[PDB]
Design an enzyme around this catalytic site. Structure first.
Site, PDB file in Angstrom:
ATOM      1  N   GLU A   1      39.440  31.550  45.047  1.00  0.00           N
ATOM      2  CA  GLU A   1      40.502  32.534  45.484  1.00  0.00           C
ATOM      3  C   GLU A   1      40.104  33.898  44.806  1.00  0.00           C
ATOM      4  O   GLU A   1      40.900  34.733  45.508  1.00  0.00           O
ATOM      5  CB  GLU A   1      41.544  31.441  44.384  1.00  0.00           C
ATOM      6  CG  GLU A   1      41.837  30.456  44.993  1.00  0.00           C
ATOM      7  CD  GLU A   1      41.062  29.217  44.960  1.00  0.00           C
ATOM      8  OE1 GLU A   1      40.289  29.326  43.719  1.00  0.00           O
ATOM      9  OE2 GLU A   1      41.517  27.987  44.728  1.00  0.00           O
TER      10      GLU A   1
ATOM     11  N   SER B   1      50.955  32.140  38.478  1.00  0.00           N
ATOM     12  CA  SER B   1      51.937  31.458  37.174  1.00  0.00           C
ATOM     13  C   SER B   1      51.138  31.886  35.870  1.00  0.00           C
ATOM     14  O   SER B   1      52.314  32.970  35.301  1.00  0.00           O
ATOM     15  CB  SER B   1      50.979  30.316  37.067  1.00  0.00           C
ATOM     16  OG  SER B   1      49.796  29.703  36.781  1.00  0.00           O
TER      17      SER B   1
ATOM     18  N   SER C   1      45.759  37.266  36.069  1.00  0.00           N
ATOM     19  CA  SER C   1      44.250  38.213  36.133  1.00  0.00           C
ATOM     20  C   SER C   1      43.762  39.374  36.125  1.00  0.00           C
ATOM     21  O   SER C   1      45.197  39.983  37.488  1.00  0.00           O
ATOM     22  CB  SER C   1      43.479  37.224  36.609  1.00  0.00           C
ATOM     23  OG  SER C   1      43.362  36.333  36.420  1.00  0.00           O
TER      24      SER C   1
ATOM     25  N   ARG D   1      36.504  39.955  36.004  1.00  0.00           N
ATOM     26  CA  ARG D   1      37.697  40.034  35.674  1.00  0.00           C
ATOM     27  C   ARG D   1      37.677  40.156  33.581  1.00  0.00           C
ATOM     28  O   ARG D   1      37.470  40.081  33.643  1.00  0.00           O
ATOM     29  CB  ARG D   1      38.383  38.854  35.178  1.00  0.00           C
ATOM     30  CG  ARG D   1      39.900  38.090  35.180  1.00  0.00           C
ATOM     31  CD  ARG D   1      39.708  36.406  35.219  1.00  0.00           C
ATOM     32  NE  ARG D   1      40.926  35.987  33.789  1.00  0.00           N
ATOM     33  CZ  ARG D   1      41.407  36.187  32.871  1.00  0.00           C
ATOM     34  NH1 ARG D   1      40.479  36.642  32.234  1.00  0.00           N
ATOM     35  NH2 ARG D   1      42.818  35.944  32.544  1.00  0.00           N
TER      36      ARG D   1
END
Ligand SMILES: CC(=O)SCCNC(=O)CCNC(=O)[C@H](O)C(C)(C)COP(=O)(O)OP(=O)(O)OC[C@H]1O[C@@H](n2cnc3c(N)ncnc32)[C@H](O)[C@@H]1OP(=O)(O)O
Ligand SMILES: CC(=O)SCCNC(=O)CCNC(=O)[C@H](O)C(C)(C)COP(=O)(O)OP(=O)(O)OC[C@H]1O[C@@H](n2cnc3c(N)ncnc32)[C@H](O)[C@@H]1OP(=O)(O)O
EC number: 2.7.1.33
Lengths: 348, 353
Positions: free
Chosen positions: A121, A175, A178, A190
């Site tokens: 993703e 949710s 990042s 990240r």
């Protein structure tokens, strides 16, 4: 150059599939002409319940001119899409199905014979986001921000030029959160994140107000006043905290006034919901700001399912970043948010 | 050196007063010997209903303003503050003849109340300024500073002494209803670099809404018995294990209270679990803000203080865990034994001279 055709990329979510597909315009083979006509028919059926206005016209992809389309449909209808593909002889829906999204694995289960090639993703997100921004939005603005962000009830959406976006800080709010530092087309990572994201907002709203959905929680919040649950600096100092220049309207303690039974009695559902949203957005703005400073990046873009309902969240995020950066950083947003994963999948 | 005698400082809160006073060891004058006996009588009266805890806090044979003495710490109801003032005056304390330099959220109301029964000017001192002055002095004079070894495991981490002789630079994270973060570079050079509104008041506020508890002590008790993973969504709940690609342990929290979006989870979650989740959410976030401030300010000494750390060792251990996690073991959370009395000591150091 992609092997089979037609070219498409999909982001299979728990409820909706986001699909991007390429419509070539220089056609010389009758077989490709009907392939294009089939895709149009497919799109009309799947979308039979804005995205049409996100269409990127006459762009050059993999050496061919064409239009990039974007559609979303229930994961419930994905089997139909697959069968349409096979019935209309699509070689791309023959070999193996490539896709990203959280409902990807779940889907391969419910689904006949089919081999799923799962793509990440965040990797798809980054690749697609950078690509869309590179080809612009039909010459117009793909990126925007809210001028006068310090006044959420008065700020105005204005275009922003993100010609050479690098370096870039991408704050992905799902949710959870990042945060990615993007140095180049192939150099990004990240750097950090926060567990206080959209899931915390809905989660806390559900427990405090009884709402049953993200849509309902945001609706309550739009009607509430957070300062009824939060303790403001002014509630402590009787105005601004002079010594350290904290303005009186700044939040001193989130839900801070809910320690008093009396305050809890009168506080309304809508107030608790807006206080929940304000706590989350102000905190994200702080984390993003400190990360931007530490990374030495002055372009901060916010994406994620959390921004897909109301422009309220986006405005509060703009307000927050503007506050923590003392007006030095502007919160940036993108018109094609929601479809970057799909586009990233198509490029791959 | 302070003008009056004896030397004391007070932090006036809503219901209680925190007072620190100096007991000189090298006395040659009878009047001073009497001041010392008067202080002890005043201490006894005011503390006769934490009493034994404060007594154990006494710092013996230290040096203050050039004199050897003992620094005492007591707390007493703000209702008895007028008596303390009158006692001082009756006992001939010159430090209470005209002006009182005190700090604390309840200092002003006291000025209002006492104004109707006595002549004493109140000179309000800033809480944060007092906090820093006191903190730096106490750290300068067993181990005053400590940390938790093996902080990655809150269930087994052990309190260990931490030598903090070289105080500067220092990052002070003050946790009360809200959070203030101060960067201290030297004795008189420090500033509030940032803060967060998600602090102690947030924990109590949410806890009171979610569990029905009526106090901080109860909320923390519930939190000690609960399991936050019953309310929070972990990285494993999403990827069925660790998130390889970006190296996120399966046990890391993906979304605080994120599992509460499902009716099934809300039906089975306990109040104790929601309280713990609230505490975990707040401590992990503070740890993150602190670590980022530390890196940006280039400071590797992070001390946590504030009333949010007085009712439990649980919060301290959780903050230690959070800071260890965000710094990947490069930063250790520090704490101080005389935590709740820094404001009072700072006020004492601020006596008119
Ligand atoms: C001690 C601590 O555990 S502190 C919390 C540390 N945790 C983190 O930094 C992770 C924060 N969360 C995230 O980055 C995201 O939730 C992810 C990457 C795990 C999952 O992506 P999301 O978009 O939230 O999930 P989605 O909505 O698709 O389901
Ligand atoms: C847009 C925004 O408002 S983002 C929030 C910005 N706010 C802040 O940085 C303030 C955070 N809070 C604090 O620093 C503290 O709550 C203070 C300094 C205002 C008050 O001190 P506290 O210890 O909370 O109050 P106390 O418990 O003594 O009463």
């Amino acid at each position: 150059v992609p092997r089979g055709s037609p070219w498409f990329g999909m982001d299979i979510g728990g409820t909706l599939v986001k699909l991007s597909y390429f419509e070539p315009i220089d056609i010389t083979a009758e077989e490709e002409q009907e392939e294009v006509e089939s895709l149009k028919s497919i799109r009309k059926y799947l979308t039979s319940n804005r995205d049409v206005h996100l269409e990127l016209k006459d762009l050059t992809l993999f050496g061919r001119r064409g239009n990039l389309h974007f559609i979303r449909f229930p994961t419930q209808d994905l089997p139909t899409f697959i069968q349409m593909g096979r019935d209309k002889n699509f070689s791309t829906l023959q070999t193996v199905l490539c896709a990203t999204g959280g409902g990807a694995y779940k889907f391969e289960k419910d689904f006949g014979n089919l081999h799923l090639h799962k793509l990440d993703e965040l990797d798809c997100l980054v690749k697609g986001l950078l690509y869309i921004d590179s080809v612009s939005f039909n010459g117009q603005a793909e990126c925007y921000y809210f001028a006068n962000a310090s006044e959420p009830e008065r700020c105005q959406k204005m275009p922003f030029n993100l010609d050479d976006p690098y370096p870039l800080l991408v704050v992905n709010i799902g949710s959870g959160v990042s945060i990615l530092a993007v140095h180049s087309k192939d150099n990004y990572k990240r750097v950090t994140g926060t567990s206080l994201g959209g899931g915390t907002f809905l989660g806390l709203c559900s427990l405090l107000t009884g709402c049953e959905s993200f849509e309902e929680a945001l609706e309550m919040a739009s009607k509430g006043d957070s300062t009824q649950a939060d303790k403001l600096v002014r509630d402590i100092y009787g105005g601004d905290y002079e010594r350290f220049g904290l303005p009186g309207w700044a939040v001193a303690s989130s839900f801070g006034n809910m320690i008093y039974k009396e305050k809890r009695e009168s506080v309304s559902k809508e107030d608790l919901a807006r206080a929940t949203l304000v706590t989350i957005t102000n905190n994200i703005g702080s984390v993003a700001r400190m990360c931007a400073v530490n990374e030495k990046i002055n372009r901060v873009v916010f994406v994620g399912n959390f921004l897909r309902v109301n422009t309220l969240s986006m405005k509060l995020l703009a307000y927050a970043l503007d506050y923590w950066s003392k007006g030095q950083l502007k919160a940036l947003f993108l018109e094609h948010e929601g479809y970057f994963g799909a586009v990233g999948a198509l490029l791959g």
